[PDB]
Amino acid sequence: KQVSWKLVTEYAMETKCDDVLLLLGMYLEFQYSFEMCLKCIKKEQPSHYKYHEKHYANAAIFADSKNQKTICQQAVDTVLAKKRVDSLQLTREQMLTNRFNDLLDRMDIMFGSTGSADIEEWMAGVAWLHCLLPKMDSVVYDFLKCMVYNIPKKRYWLFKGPIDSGKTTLAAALLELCGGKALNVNLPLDRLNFELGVAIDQFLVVFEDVKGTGGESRDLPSGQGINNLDNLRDYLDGSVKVNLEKKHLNKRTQIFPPGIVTMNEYSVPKTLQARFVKQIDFRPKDYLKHCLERSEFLLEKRIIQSGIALLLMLIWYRPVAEFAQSIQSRIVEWKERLDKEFSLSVYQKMKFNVAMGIGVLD
Amino acid sequence: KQVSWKLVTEYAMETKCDDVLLLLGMYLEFQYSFEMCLKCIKKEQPSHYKYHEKHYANAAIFADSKNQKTICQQAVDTVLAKKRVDSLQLTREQMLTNRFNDLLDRMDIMFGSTGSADIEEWMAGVAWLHCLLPKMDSVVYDFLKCMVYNIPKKRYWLFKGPIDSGKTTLAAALLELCGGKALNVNLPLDRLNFELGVAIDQFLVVFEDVKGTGGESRDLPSGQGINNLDNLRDYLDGSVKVNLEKKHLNKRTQIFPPGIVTMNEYSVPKTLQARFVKQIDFRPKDYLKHCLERSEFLLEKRIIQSGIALLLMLIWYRPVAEFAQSIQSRIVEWKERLDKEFSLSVYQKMKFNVAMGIGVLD
Amino acid sequence: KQVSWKLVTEYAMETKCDDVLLLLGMYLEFQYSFEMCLKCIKKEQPSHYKYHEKHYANAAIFADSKNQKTICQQAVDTVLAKKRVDSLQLTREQMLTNRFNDLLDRMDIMFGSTGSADIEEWMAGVAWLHCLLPKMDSVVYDFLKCMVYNIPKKRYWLFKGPIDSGKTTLAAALLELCGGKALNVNLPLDRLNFELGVAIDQFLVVFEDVKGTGGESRDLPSGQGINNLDNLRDYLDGSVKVNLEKKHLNKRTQIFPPGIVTMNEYSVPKTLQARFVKQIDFRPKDYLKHCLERSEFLLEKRIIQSGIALLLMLIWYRPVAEFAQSIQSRIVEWKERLDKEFSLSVYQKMKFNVAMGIGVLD
Amino acid sequence: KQVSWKLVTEYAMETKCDDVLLLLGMYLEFQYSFEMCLKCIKKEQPSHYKYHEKHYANAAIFADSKNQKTICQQAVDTVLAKKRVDSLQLTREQMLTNRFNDLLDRMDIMFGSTGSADIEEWMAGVAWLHCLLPKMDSVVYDFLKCMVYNIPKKRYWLFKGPIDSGKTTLAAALLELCGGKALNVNLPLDRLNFELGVAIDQFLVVFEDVKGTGGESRDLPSGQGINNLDNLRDYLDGSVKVNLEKKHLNKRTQIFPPGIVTMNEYSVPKTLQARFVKQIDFRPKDYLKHCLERSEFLLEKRIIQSGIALLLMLIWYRPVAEFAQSIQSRIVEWKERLDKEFSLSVYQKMKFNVAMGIGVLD
Amino acid sequence: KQVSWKLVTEYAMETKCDDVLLLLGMYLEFQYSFEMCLKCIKKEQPSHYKYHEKHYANAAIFADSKNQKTICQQAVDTVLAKKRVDSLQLTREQMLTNRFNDLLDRMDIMFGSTGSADIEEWMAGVAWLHCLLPKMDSVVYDFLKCMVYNIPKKRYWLFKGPIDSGKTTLAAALLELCGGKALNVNLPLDRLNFELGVAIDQFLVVFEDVKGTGGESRDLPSGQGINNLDNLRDYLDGSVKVNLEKKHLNKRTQIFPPGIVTMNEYSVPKTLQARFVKQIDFRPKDYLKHCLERSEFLLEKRIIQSGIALLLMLIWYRPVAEFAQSIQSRIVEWKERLDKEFSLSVYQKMKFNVAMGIGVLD
DNA sequence: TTTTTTT
Numbered sequence A, B, C, D, E: 001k002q003v004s005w006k007l008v009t010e011y012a013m014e015t016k017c018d019d020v021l022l023l024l025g026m027y028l029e030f031q032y033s034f035e036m037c038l039k040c041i042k043k044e045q046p047s048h049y050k051y052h053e054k055h056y057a058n059a060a061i062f063a064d065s066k067n068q069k070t071i072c073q074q075a076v077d078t079v080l081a082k083k084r085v086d087s088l089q090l091t092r093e094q095m096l097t098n099r100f101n102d103l104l105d106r107m108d109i110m111f112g113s114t115g116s117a118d119i120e121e122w123m124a125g126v127a128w129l130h131c132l133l134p135k136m137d138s139v140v141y142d143f144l145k146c147m148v149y150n151i152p153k154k155r156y157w158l159f160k161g162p163i164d165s166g167k168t169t170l171a172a173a174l175l176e177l178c179g180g181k182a183l184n185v186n187l188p189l190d191r192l193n194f195e196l197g198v199a200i201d202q203f204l205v206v207f208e209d210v211k212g213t214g215g216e217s218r219d220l221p222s223g224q225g226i227n228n229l230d231n232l233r234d235y236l237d238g239s240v241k242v243n244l245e246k247k248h249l250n251k252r253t254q255i256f257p258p259g260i261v262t263m264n265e266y267s268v269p270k271t272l273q274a275r276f277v278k279q280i281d282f283r284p285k286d287y288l289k290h291c292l293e294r295s296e297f298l299l300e301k302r303i304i305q306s307g308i309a310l311l312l313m314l315i316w317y318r319p320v321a322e323f324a325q326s327i328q329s330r331i332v333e334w335k336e337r338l339d340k341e342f343s344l345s346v347y348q349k350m351k352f353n354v355a356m357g358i359g360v361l362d
Numbered sequence F: 001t002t003t004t005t006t007t
């Protein structure tokens, strides 16, 4: 009897496998009998115990196949084709909604019955983040809106502030919440032609640790980053398409992704300042300094600086009507799971402890 | 009347063979008659004598085949696929435990009565390795826990020290103990793309003797290694997935493995220093040199650079409760086997022989 | 009827042929009728006249075949597979023993009545070579021991000296005796990876005529060779496995071969000096030049470069107990044959002729 | 009916096509009718008029084939395979004898009544060539001996001298006589790999016109040639096998061809000077210049550059005993042709015309 | 029914189509009905309307084919194979005859009843171009004979100096007349390798506006071109085959084309100028500027750059016996046509109007 | 596709 290549493609699509060897290995595990399958009995991984019954008959015949890598290549090209169609055709709200749905899938297993995530440390992460900046959750919601709207000139945000003030901390978290990448624009004028190519097909970008020409009289190191950005005018504005180039690849023309500029207390050109819609002064405060050394429970299990923590902050603080109509259904379920586990008095006391510069107690 | 591709894949899985030519060669040895087979009678290699009788029928048909390399390729891809599956599904504790089980099986063969290793020579290696760094067994244990608790930014260790100070010796031993690959990054960056691809699904990587800039006043030649690593910060920091590539095969998107950077007294950039959680300064010690001169079996048999010598050290020094519960049973068996072969007084006499620079085993 | 692919593999395996065009060319000579084959009647090449009668039937069908190169590719891959199986499963002493057996077979053909060699001229080569270095036969024996034991870091020998001092001569002789490849590291670093890939599954490598900097006062031109070798420290160490690369094949991980570096009075970094266990300083001897001018048959027949000359030297000078058990029975036959042919007086006449700078056979 | 791949291979072997498109084009010309064929009637090209009648049937079927390039690839691979077997299995003296026989076949066609040439003009070439260097026939005979004997390190010759001194002229004539190819080593060092790959399986190479870095005070432009050539010291030696490389094929290991270096009066390093056995100082002569202006048929017909002029010179000047036994028969009938058509008084008149700086035919 | 691969090859041969996608596109236009075909009604492109009726039956079956690119590949390879055979076997005089035949075919369509070109405007082009140099008829015929006879080291011409004096104009016309390509040697020396691969199988090259280091006092920009040409002086002379090279293709061995160099007055090195045998230079005429100004169609229709204009010039002012015999029957037809519908009174009136700087046609 | 070309 014949292998169904369509069934293999269904498994690849349902699990979003873009790797031919991962697909081959996982599918070969289904060749063993379901009735006695230890992995289905003890339910380690969802990509197995959901699918083994449906695919067992096909996987037996697949294990006898002489074509196995060809079958998987076609299935992986089907998944790559769906990604490519979605990239060109989705509206930018739907792209972010797909990212949030994927993060909620990670939530549902990360905080699963097998969940190594306790709600408690993740909610302490949320309270740390919500204490970092005045009216923080509006700042995150405003960031997502301007990044989704992608409106010309009114795109890039300037994070200006002292060292050890948390600016890389939040920028690195927003890359995980949205998808995106960071660029090192400090280079001489020639090499940044290739560095800018890192933005190709990204949803979002950040310019990290931009050095300026001035500030040596304040013991800031001089560097050409800011003077470069004043020349990258059209990439910021996003009014016209720019041609972007990569290591031994030919140029792509697209609108440059929106982003964030993270900068110390450097002086800026008036032209560059006029091209940032929002300036946020990050400034350090000592009770957060003291809280951190008191609170390694934020830094273990990667909870700080992770975008899944910022999503949890949005679920806790925003009204449900602000999320997309398709994800509103899943977000109310995560609302009530937070409501049950973290009563408002427990959260308030935890945030009060953060205001007192101390970790979780009681 | 036709080749079972399934039996060949089964042999490759049982042998854990990642190389197409190795599989082709070994499987072709089975084409000759089992009854007259000198290798089965002489019992040279287990990969032959355990399997010849079972595979003889299939190997005779395989020797006539017109497809041989294609059959081997599918088998080898099955073994690489199981490695991908295990790398994505298993916890790092289980990965290290599987490696210890493989090493302990190899110890049972090697110290068995059918074996060839005198355990006295291997315990002399333990004595010599415990002299190399203070509290070596806690240092090995700390390294193991660091590679298991893969905490971002806190993933990499730096070994520093002059010529013949023991850096490569301990890195090679930890590498065998944990499993991993050595990478040379002294080559230029565009050619490192396929070098870095060797880290696919490995537990450790070691960056062997990376060359810095400067140091010519210390008679150290310059090279690109440090500058290349400083261009790879997300691979060291491990905050986000990177794309690793192999020829004529699709890329792998994974977090790059943790491990060891080794170097000879070069100056290290502050940005790179921020990513090495512990630095060990090796010193040349003349008593170890004099001991090795008089105990050349340690270097001829490669005992002091072997992971089996470090695994014997962990069995000797560490509690049972520090090992994973699956493997505790055969570890306590190995402890009583060590207590059988050695008094503590023999081991203290060995370590005194080392410290005095006289021959160990005297 | 149809072509036997197995017989083509059997010919390839018997001739140890790993070039696909060489196999194709030789097997096509068997097309023509065995009864009248001029090469069989003249007995030019053993690879032809031994095999034509057996393969004539298969070669006639092979000449009509439409996929000839595909047959030869499978045959060549079988030869490479056995070579890789031998490389992992044999001890280095067995590998040297197998190599000497192959050399002794070639000597039996050279010095038999069918052979074109004169054993007096080859023993004149042994006389000339024994004059090159002090205790030459022990230097060869110590080298063989070094290559068999393959001790970490104690693996490479450095041959140093001026122009026409004999470095390349001895290196070529040891390369034929042990088997191995010569590599040029003077070419630029970014293409050097494919040159290093020639080392795969080889017993020795010889880095020939490496250039340094800082000889220009001596009138030695500058070059990158020594800088490249200092980037390849972990390859020369042989503690860890290194990733070796052929075109269109994925990397193989193996311990890099031991061997020889030949160099002309350049300065060596102390880091690189730590990888060499012995340095041999070759000094030009005018009596050897005057001897060669008068005995040009040594250069024309390439006797003093040959491994067969060093094998004769070992048979003349070394005890039988220094050879491996399997070859001692052939070595005693060869010792008797040499003692029959050469009195010590004839040899001491030759060695005195060399020292006088006379024609060695005079 | 089926196309015979054997007949295509036979045509390629008899024509010695190592070009797939040349074979395809040539063989497709046989698809048209033999009786009407204008190319056969005119007898333009021997590769057509000898073979069309025999191959007509097969070429008609081949024109209907869907496999045409695959058929020609096998034929071309068979011609290359024979060439590689002959490289590894012939003596260099047989290789030269074969080349002379091929040039004598050309001479039979050139100076036969079908041919365009006539011997008087080519014998004037011999007279002009004999005037260029003293004892030119011994020089050419010594060169042939040097290239046949291929003595290690005593196997490259240097042609040195001013602009327009005859260096490239004589090198080209020797290159056509012996076969082999010219290499341009003035390129940058990283491209050089593929240039040197042209030498694979060749009998000679000529390093044309290498530039040095001195002598700009002599108005000689500087360049990298001599420095590149000093990196290739082990290639010029010919003691070891070097690893040659052509695009998209992995490396081939062989002894580099012997050859000629042509050079203006740049300073040469002692390391590279040691690898030349003989230096020929060309000096320009005004009577030769005046002669060529008046006898320009020598340049138009390229008689001055041709290997056939040097072969005619050897036939006129050397004993029949100096030729290989197989070719001595054709040499005596060629000597008889020359004696019959040229009196020594005509040839001495020609030599006297050249010395008088007047047109050779007057 | 099956596709005739033979008919696709016929079409490609008759179209001289050496591009696979062009062939595929052209042939897929033939699948639609011949009787309704708008392109055959409008008669836009000759490669369509001449061939569609013949090929319709085969093109409909070809549209249903699953092999379509494989069919076109075989066809294109046949066209390239004929070009290879022609390059090796044709005399240069036959090559130039073929080029003239193809240009006369264009002239028949271009001045046909369907032709979009008024022959008067092109004859006015003959009037302008006849004035550009003293007796242009002689220089062009001398150039053509020089390019046919191809005498080694005596086969390049230089145009130097004045701007707006016609150097590139006449070079472009000679280049279309003969066939061949322009080269820009000022590229980086690494790129110069690929630059020269444009000359592969070309009949001419023009080195265009090549630049040197000096001449600053004449306001000439510096450049590396002449320094690169000196590395190629052995390519220019054509005494020997050179290993020309292009991206991703193995080197090809051939004699470099003859050509023209256009240049500004840099000081050309002796080692390079010794490989050139003409300099011919231009002087701007004020009345010609006025004639172009008053007869702009000479530039707008690209008349004076074109090879058809020089062929018309040669058809007028050289005798029929100076062309190759095969084409003389077509040249008498064009002589009659031009002497019919134009008169020497009209031509001398045009060259008069040109001498007056007024509009040519009146 | 990788290698080569690009960096």
Ligand SMILES: Nc1ncnc2c1ncn2[C@@H]1O[C@H](COP(=O)(O)OP(=O)(O)NP(=O)(O)O)[C@@H](O)[C@H]1O
Binding pocket: A161, A162, A163, A164, A165, A166, A167, A168, A169, A170, A209, A264, A283, A284, A285, A286, A287, A288, A289, A292
């Ligand atoms: N109020 C604070 N006081 C001190 N440290 C803080 C404070 N808030 C955050 N941090 C910590 O500062 C560390 C560095 O965060 P980061 O976002 O890199 O700061 P930054 O301002 O971008 N520093 P720099 O990258 O040097 O410009 C993180 O561990 C934060 O948790």
Ligand SMILES: Nc1ncnc2c1ncn2[C@@H]1O[C@H](COP(=O)(O)OP(=O)(O)NP(=O)(O)O)[C@@H](O)[C@H]1O
Binding pocket: B132, B161, B162, B163, B164, B165, B166, B167, B168, B169, B170, B209, B263, B264, B282, B283, B284, B285, B286, B288, B289, B292, B299, C152, C153, C271, C274
């Ligand atoms: N601390 C030590 N003191 C003395 N000898 C030692 C020590 N460690 C190692 N050795 C010897 O030195 C050899 C090389 O040690 P190795 O680990 O390669 O040194 P390393 O520090 O990596 N030197 P390098 O890589 O050249 O910077 C070992 O094989 C031992 O013979």
Ligand SMILES: Nc1ncnc2c1ncn2[C@@H]1O[C@H](COP(=O)(O)OP(=O)(O)NP(=O)(O)O)[C@@H](O)[C@H]1O
Binding pocket: C132, C161, C162, C163, C164, C165, C166, C167, C168, C169, C170, C209, C262, C263, C264, C282, C283, C284, C285, C286, C288, C289, C292, C299, D152, D153, D271, D274
């Ligand atoms: N010790 C010696 N004294 C004199 N002549 C020698 C000596 N050894 C070799 N020769 C001659 O020199 C030739 C080349 O020897 P070779 O081994 O290439 O020397 P080398 O020291 O490697 N020279 P180089 O390669 O230029 O650095 C041999 O073929 C002999 O003719």
Ligand SMILES: Nc1ncnc2c1ncn2[C@@H]1O[C@H](COP(=O)(O)OP(=O)(O)NP(=O)(O)O)[C@@H](O)[C@H]1O
Binding pocket: D132, D162, D163, D164, D165, D166, D167, D168, D169, D170, D209, D262, D264, D282, D283, D284, D285, D286, D288, D289, D292, E153, E239, E271
């Ligand atoms: N010795 C000579 N004296 C005078 N004219 C000569 C001599 N040899 C050659 N010629 C002429 O000079 C031309 C160039 O000779 P050729 O051998 O190419 O020069 P070359 O010495 O190699 N110069 P170069 O190419 O710069 O290395 C030939 O075509 C002859 O016309």
Ligand SMILES: Nc1ncnc2c1ncn2[C@@H]1O[C@H](COP(=O)(O)OP(=O)(O)NP(=O)(O)O)[C@@H](O)[C@H]1O
Binding pocket: E132, E162, E163, E164, E165, E166, E167, E168, E169, E170, E209, E262, E283, E284, E285, E286, E288, E289, E292
């Ligand atoms: N003899 C001439 N009298 C008047 N105009 C001329 C003449 N020759 C050329 N021109 C015009 O000059 C312009 C440029 O000619 P062109 O041949 O491209 O210049 P060029 O000499 O190659 N200059 P350059 O490209 O710098 O080498 C065109 O408009 C021509 O029509």
Ligand SMILES: [Mg+2]
Binding pocket: A164, A166, A167, A168, A169
């Ligand atoms: Mg920061």
Ligand SMILES: [Mg+2]
Binding pocket: D167, D168, D169, D209, D262
């Ligand atoms: Mg020359």
Ligand SMILES: [Mg+2]
Binding pocket: E167, E168, E169, E209, E262
């Ligand atoms: Mg111009």
